[PDB]
Amino acid sequence: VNSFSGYLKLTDNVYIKNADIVEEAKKVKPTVVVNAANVYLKHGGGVAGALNKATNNAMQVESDDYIATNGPLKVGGSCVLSGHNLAKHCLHVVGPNVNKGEDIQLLKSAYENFNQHEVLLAPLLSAGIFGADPIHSLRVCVDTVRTNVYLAVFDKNLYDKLVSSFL
Ligand SMILES: O=C1NS(=O)(=O)c2ccccc21
Known part of the structure; x- marks a missing residue:
């Protein structure tokens, strides 16, 4: 049993909620928040x-x-830094930015970083201003992540579309 509340269960390991990830992190103080x-x-x-x-x-x-110290990350890569006042840790994950021409096939590699953490609070990678189709991002998430992921979707309209179109 963990402290996440109000999520819809999509699969054995993937959960989703219409929520501001900032407000969710502040309330839950999860071990890992994904940036x-x-x-x-x-x-x-x-x-x-x-x-x-x-x-x-x-x-x-x-x-x-x-x-x-380290130079830039790779597209599809990650690093673990402090979670500050939001979480124990922040896992900074780089999904491909479609609005910069990056290979969408790198989205699976991005989500593979989540498998190094037993539980995470996360957004949909490459969604929003990164330009990918959020329905696609959710499918890659479900088909890639094996650890327990709690997805926060800011936009209520998109949340409802993600749930109602989920296979
Ligand atoms: O993909 C998305 N994540 S979001 O909820 O921030 C959002 C808002 C508006 C249009 C698209 C999207």
Whole structure:
């Protein structure tokens, strides 16, 4: 038994809710929150900008030190950093950005990072301002992630479409 409340069960291991991931993280304080990162860990907008704002920019300060030491992530890759006031850890995962021309086949590689963590609070990778079809992102998630994932979908309209179209 864990602390996640109000989720619809899609599969053995995947759950979904219409929720602001920031507000969900603040309430649950999960072991792992996933960020929809870019390779530079520049948390300007979308999920990343909202998570970073909720940390009072501490996420960005830590991220800048990480990049200065290690260089950029790979598209499809990840790193584990602090969760600050939101979670124990933040798993920064880079899904392909369709609005930059990145290979959508890299979405499966992105979701494979989640399998290194027993439980995660996450957004749909490559959705929103990353330009991918969220229905596709949910299918890749279900077909790739084997650990327990709690998906927060900000947009109520999209949430209802994801549930009602789920196979
Ligand atoms: O894919 C998406 N995640 S979201 O809920 O932020 C959203 C809002 C509007 C259009 C698309 C999308």
